[PDB]
Each structure stands twice: as C-alpha cells, then as structure tokens.
Scaffold this motif. Structure first.
Motif, mmCIF file in Angstrom:
data_model
loop_
_atom_site.group_PDB
_atom_site.id
_atom_site.type_symbol
_atom_site.label_atom_id
_atom_site.label_comp_id
_atom_site.label_asym_id
_atom_site.label_seq_id
_atom_site.Cartn_x
_atom_site.Cartn_y
_atom_site.Cartn_z
ATOM 1 N N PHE A 1 0.841 -1.183 0.000
ATOM 2 C CA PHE A 1 0.000 0.000 0.000
ATOM 3 C C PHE A 1 0.885 1.245 0.000
ATOM 4 C CE2 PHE A 1 -2.659 3.308 1.799
ATOM 5 C CZ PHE A 1 -3.770 3.166 0.976
ATOM 6 N N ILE B 1 -0.266 -7.054 6.885
ATOM 7 C CA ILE B 1 -1.728 -7.084 7.013
ATOM 8 C C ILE B 1 -2.316 -6.860 5.624
ATOM 9 C CG2 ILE B 1 -3.753 -5.772 7.787
ATOM 10 C CD1 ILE B 1 -2.285 -5.553 10.570
ATOM 11 N N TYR C 1 -0.402 -3.958 3.702
ATOM 12 C CA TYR C 1 0.338 -3.015 4.537
ATOM 13 C C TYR C 1 1.596 -3.696 5.062
ATOM 14 C CZ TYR C 1 -3.640 0.117 4.396
ATOM 15 O OH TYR C 1 -4.617 1.014 4.006
ATOM 16 N N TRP C 2 2.745 -3.127 4.716
ATOM 17 C CA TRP C 2 4.053 -3.566 5.188
ATOM 18 C C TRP C 2 5.094 -2.600 4.627
ATOM 19 C CZ3 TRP C 2 7.734 -4.588 1.466
ATOM 20 C CH2 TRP C 2 7.266 -4.870 0.176
ATOM 21 N N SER C 3 6.244 -2.573 5.277
ATOM 22 C CA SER C 3 7.440 -1.924 4.729
ATOM 23 C C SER C 3 8.662 -2.571 5.378
ATOM 24 C CB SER C 3 7.422 -0.408 4.956
ATOM 25 O OG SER C 3 7.572 -0.137 6.329
ATOM 26 N N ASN D 1 8.932 -3.870 8.857
ATOM 27 C CA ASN D 1 8.305 -5.154 9.150
ATOM 28 C C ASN D 1 9.142 -6.356 8.717
ATOM 29 O OD1 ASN D 1 5.521 -3.251 8.305
ATOM 30 N ND2 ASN D 1 5.786 -4.131 10.374
ATOM 31 N N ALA E 1 7.453 5.610 8.085
ATOM 32 C CA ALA E 1 6.981 4.294 8.524
ATOM 33 C C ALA E 1 7.260 4.064 10.011
ATOM 34 C CB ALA E 1 7.580 3.184 7.663
ATOM 35 N N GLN F 1 4.499 3.568 13.187
ATOM 36 C CA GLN F 1 4.493 2.525 14.210
ATOM 37 C C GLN F 1 4.384 3.119 15.622
ATOM 38 O OE1 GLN F 1 8.140 0.244 13.052
ATOM 39 N NE2 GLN F 1 6.662 -1.431 12.842
ATOM 40 N N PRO G 1 2.854 -6.665 15.580
ATOM 41 C CA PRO G 1 3.445 -5.352 15.290
ATOM 42 C C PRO G 1 2.587 -4.508 14.359
ATOM 43 C CG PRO G 1 4.585 -7.118 14.070
ATOM 44 C CD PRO G 1 3.641 -7.788 15.025
ATOM 45 N N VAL G 2 2.735 -3.191 14.485
ATOM 46 C CA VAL G 2 2.136 -2.283 13.522
ATOM 47 C C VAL G 2 2.794 -2.478 12.161
ATOM 48 C CG1 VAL G 2 1.721 0.134 12.956
ATOM 49 C CG2 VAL G 2 1.676 -0.597 15.352
ATOM 50 N N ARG G 3 1.972 -2.619 11.115
ATOM 51 C CA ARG G 3 2.448 -2.634 9.734
ATOM 52 C C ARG G 3 2.321 -1.225 9.175
ATOM 53 N NH1 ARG G 3 1.273 -7.570 12.539
ATOM 54 N NH2 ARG G 3 1.361 -9.317 11.043
ATOM 55 N N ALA G 4 3.408 -0.666 8.667
ATOM 56 C CA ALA G 4 3.413 0.722 8.254
ATOM 57 C C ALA G 4 3.862 0.868 6.813
ATOM 58 C CB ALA G 4 4.327 1.558 9.153
ATOM 59 N N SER G 5 3.264 1.835 6.118
ATOM 60 C CA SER G 5 3.596 2.190 4.741
ATOM 61 C C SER G 5 4.546 3.387 4.703
ATOM 62 C CB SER G 5 2.332 2.604 3.996
ATOM 63 O OG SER G 5 1.953 3.953 4.336
ATOM 64 N N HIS G 6 4.944 3.774 3.485
ATOM 65 C CA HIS G 6 5.736 4.969 3.234
ATOM 66 C C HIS G 6 4.894 6.172 2.834
ATOM 67 C CE1 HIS G 6 9.540 3.119 3.940
ATOM 68 N NE2 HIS G 6 9.306 2.157 3.066
ATOM 69 N N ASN G 7 3.562 6.048 2.840
ATOM 70 C CA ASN G 7 2.688 7.175 2.541
ATOM 71 C C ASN G 7 1.866 7.605 3.762
ATOM 72 O OD1 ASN G 7 0.858 5.062 2.512
ATOM 73 N ND2 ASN G 7 -0.297 5.870 0.771
ATOM 74 N N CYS H 1 0.555 5.828 6.272
ATOM 75 C CA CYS H 1 -0.533 4.932 6.640
ATOM 76 C C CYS H 1 -0.011 3.700 7.368
ATOM 77 C CB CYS H 1 -1.362 4.499 5.411
ATOM 78 S SG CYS H 1 -2.066 5.892 4.480
ATOM 79 N N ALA I 1 -1.508 -0.200 9.604
ATOM 80 C CA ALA I 1 -2.537 -1.137 10.030
ATOM 81 C C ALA I 1 -2.012 -1.929 11.220
ATOM 82 C CB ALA I 1 -2.924 -2.101 8.890
ATOM 83 N N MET I 2 -2.881 -2.198 12.208
ATOM 84 C CA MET I 2 -2.418 -2.881 13.396
ATOM 85 C C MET I 2 -3.449 -3.877 13.900
ATOM 86 S SD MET I 2 -2.685 0.161 16.216
ATOM 87 C CE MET I 2 -4.035 1.331 16.149
ATOM 88 N N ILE J 1 -8.690 -5.038 13.804
ATOM 89 C CA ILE J 1 -7.591 -4.385 13.090
ATOM 90 C C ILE J 1 -8.021 -2.960 12.770
ATOM 91 C CG2 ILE J 1 -6.441 -4.249 10.846
ATOM 92 C CD1 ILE J 1 -6.150 -7.354 11.007
ATOM 93 N N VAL K 1 -6.957 0.423 10.587
ATOM 94 C CA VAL K 1 -6.188 1.019 9.502
ATOM 95 C C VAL K 1 -6.276 2.537 9.677
ATOM 96 C CG1 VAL K 1 -5.944 1.223 6.981
ATOM 97 C CG2 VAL K 1 -6.700 -0.940 7.980
#
Ligand code: ASD
Ligand code: ASD
Ligand code: CL
Ligand code: CL
Ligand code: MG
Lengths: 126, 128
Positions: free
Chosen positions: A40, A100, A117-119, A122, B6, B10, B73-79, B81, B83-84, B102, B104
C-alpha cells in the motif's frame, strides 16, 4: 456480498494458497476489474495478466511460506483484514515479513480490491 | 511533525492503543485531525470531526473496564498509513469477553490521524 463468516473463510483460503504457492488458484480468486496495492502506497496493479505476473514474481521461487498470526477480522459489507507472516529467502538470507492484507469482495465472492500493509520496518533477518 | 515516516507511524499507532487502554478520551481525540473521519466498525456510517469523534470514544470507553493491547506489530507504509492487530478486553454478561480488531489509519502532514477504519464484527467476539 459474502457474509462475515464467508469473508473469514475466503481470506484464510487465500493464505493457504499463498503458502502452497498455487499462482493460478490465487489469480482465480480475483475479479476482472480487481486492483492490488502491494505494498500500500504504490500504484495499483490491474489486469488479470498483470496480477498473475505479480504473484509469479513474488512466489515463483516456490520457497515462500505464509501463515496467519491471528484471526481474520471481517465486516458485514464484504470486507476484511488479516495479520500474517511471510517467510522467504532474500539473497540467500532467510527472512520474515509481517503483513496485514485488507480485502473487499464483490457480489460473486471474488476479490475486488486488495491492499497489503508492510514496509522494511516489518522485515526481520532470521 | 510532517507526514509520518513508517517508523513514526508505528510509534503513533502504538501510542493510540496505550491511550485506549488507559481510557484517556481527550488525548485520543487530540491524536485525530480536527476534521478526521472514523468508520468503526467498517461498514457503518462514518463520523466526522473531533466533536463527533469525542462523543464516540466517550460512549465506548467512558464506562471503564475496557483494556486494549497490540497482538502483533504495527504494519506501516511509506505514505503515512498503517494497520495494526489488537485485542480489546471488556465485560460481557458480567464476565470477560474479548474482541479482535484491526485498525487502519492514514495520517496527515501534521502527524494527526486523518482517517481510521476498524475491522471487526460479532465473529471476532469470544469468551472463556
Ligand atoms: C506478495 C506477498 C505474498 C502475498 C500477500 O498477500 C502479500 C505479499 C506482500 C509481501 C510480499 C509477499 C511475497 C514475498 C515477497 C515478494 C518478498 O519476498 C518481499 C515482499 C513479499
Ligand atoms: C472503539 C473500540 C476501541 C478503539 C478502537 O480502535 C476500536 C474499537 C472498536 C470496537 C469497540 C472498541 C471499544 C469497546 C467497544 C465499544 C465494546 O465494548 C464493543 C465494541 C468495542
Ligand atoms: Cl491477532
Ligand atoms: Cl501479527
Ligand atoms: Mg487538515
């Protein structure tokens, strides 16, 4: 739309297919106009050939494993979200990735949108 | 703060769970943008803005006896955002129950929550 319980089954089935590496079965789960945003933040992938290529790229090696790390969370509007962990080998180094996926299903029980969702926060080198 | 990285996502999303766990409604509301939306549960009508969001958290948490903790763990994007996965513990029919959820979130350019979607339904409720 698929009920909450049906969403839980479909999303778990998806992980089972990723884990065994059945690319054709995964692509069949998607709708004609489906989009994949994985990770994402990146532009959506669309087109059935394009989605197949994405899964072939990601799973072609045959040594990827994936397992739920907790239950699928499901809505009453054909959507759900699930936490899982992927195991893979990256330039010879075994790794794990926490992910996720959020999915919306259409009236026919096929995936209309997927967002992963990941980077690198993770990613864990085992 | 700028649009969170990111790593910053988190930290923000984990703090949010700490605030839910302790029940600090005002502090939760201030994590949201002034004009944020919440969809909780996802599938229901959104609620708009801090006034409505505050009323929602007071109605859900004000009675006490809610706890919450990340289950992974929190899953994090580079924009901006993430999800946990987490579990809420509360009381049901006089006895402990649990709800797997969950959330978002999308953050704005000031590090505040612009949107939140909470995925759960009655299939995610369990008891001893
Ligand atoms: C496609 C995929 C599995 C199916 C799924 O639902 C979500 C993901 C996202 C992360 C992918 C992973 C497959 C393995 C990948 C390509 C790696 O080796 C690095 C990133 C990772
Ligand atoms: C608001 C909330 C916590 C913050 C969060 O991020 C997600 C949720 C969704 C489920 C709520 C919960 C608070 C406690 C609630 C009201 C119950 O006792 C049943 C449903 C549940
Ligand atoms: Cl979980
Ligand atoms: Cl997890
Ligand atoms: Mg603003």
């Amino acid at each position: 739309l698929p009920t909450a319980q049906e969403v839980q089954g479909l999303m778990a089935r998806y992980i089972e297919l990723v884990d065994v590496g059945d690319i054709e079965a995964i692509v069949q789960m998607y709708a004609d106009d489906a989009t994949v945003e994985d990770p994402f933040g990146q532009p959506p992938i669309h087109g059935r050939e394009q989605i197949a290529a994405f899964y072939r790229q990601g799973l072609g090696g045959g040594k990827v494993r994936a397992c739920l790390t907790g239950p699928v969370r499901a809505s009453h509007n054909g959507c759900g979200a699930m936490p899982f962990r992927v195991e893979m080998v990256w330039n010879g180094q075994p790794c794990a990735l926490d992910v996720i996926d959020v999915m919306r299903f259409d009236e026919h029980g096929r995936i209309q949108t997927m967002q992963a969702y990941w980077s690198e926060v993770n990613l864990s080198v085992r």
